[PDB]
Ligand binder design. Structure first.
Ligand SMILES: Cc1cccc(C)c1OCC(=O)N[C@@H](Cc1ccccc1)[C@@H](O)C[C@H](Cc1ccccc1)NC(=O)[C@H](C(C)C)N1CCCNC1=O
Ligand SMILES: [Cl-]
Ligand SMILES: [Cl-]
Ligand SMILES: [Cl-]
Ligand SMILES: [Cl-]
Lengths: 99, 99
């Protein structure tokens, strides 16, 4: 697709068999979803946003589908206000900015 | 240009007679810059996201140049950790996401 930016670039993702809404975010280095269960072990990470840093759980090698495009990569889980698809998965699905 | 997302999409902007580096941020509704002076009237605003809320000054009808593309819009100024070009100005330069 080509997605314009007059509204938030929200898309449907699928993770753990569940559909969620998430923001395609070129300003985010990594992908972070609101609290949920994922398989396997997790490692600690902090990420910084507009108001400061939060602690999240880092899960690696997770299956996630973004607008129908299958990806496998790192997904953070924590106290984010919105589900965010960051550059790590945007690059996987072939996303670029164009003007 | 076509900008890939292996690295942060940082570009040079020109604003208030100054050159600065800023992030092209599809996950931002608004444009927010680190402390600087801008001309004209402003009103206070709170923005919140990851890590909570900051207070900013909202300036309207501000001229900016982003990668050689001119635009006008609202610019927020305050203690953001990074200069952010949000959708309100990304639309004006015809910036889209593509995959
Ligand atoms: C930088 C980073 C590293 C690792 C992982 C992640 C997810 C990372 O990104 C975290 C992050 O908050 N990035 C922001 C820009 C960023 C990068 C680096 C440091 C600080 C910020 C931005 O892109 C997304 C984030 C999304 C959001 C969150 C809560 C509510 C609404 C939107 N958007 C916002 O905060 C914007 C701001 C910038 C005007 N925003 C907040 C007011 C309401 N609407 C809105 O759009
Ligand atoms: Cl749109
Ligand atoms: Cl990854
Ligand atoms: Cl605007
Ligand atoms: Cl358009």
């Amino acid at each position: 697709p080509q997605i314009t930016l007059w509204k938030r670039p929200l898309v449907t993702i699928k993770i753990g068999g569940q559909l969620k809404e998430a923001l395609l975010d070129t300003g985010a280095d990594d992908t972070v979803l609101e609290e949920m269960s994922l398989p396997g072990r997790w490692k600690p990470k902090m990420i910084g946003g507009i108001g400061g840093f939060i602690k999240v759980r880092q899960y690696d090698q997770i299956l996630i589908e973004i607008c129908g495009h299958k990806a496998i990569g790192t997904v953070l889980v924590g106290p984010t206000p919105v589900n965010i698809i960051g550059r790590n998965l945007l690059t996987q699905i072939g996303c670029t900015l164009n003007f």
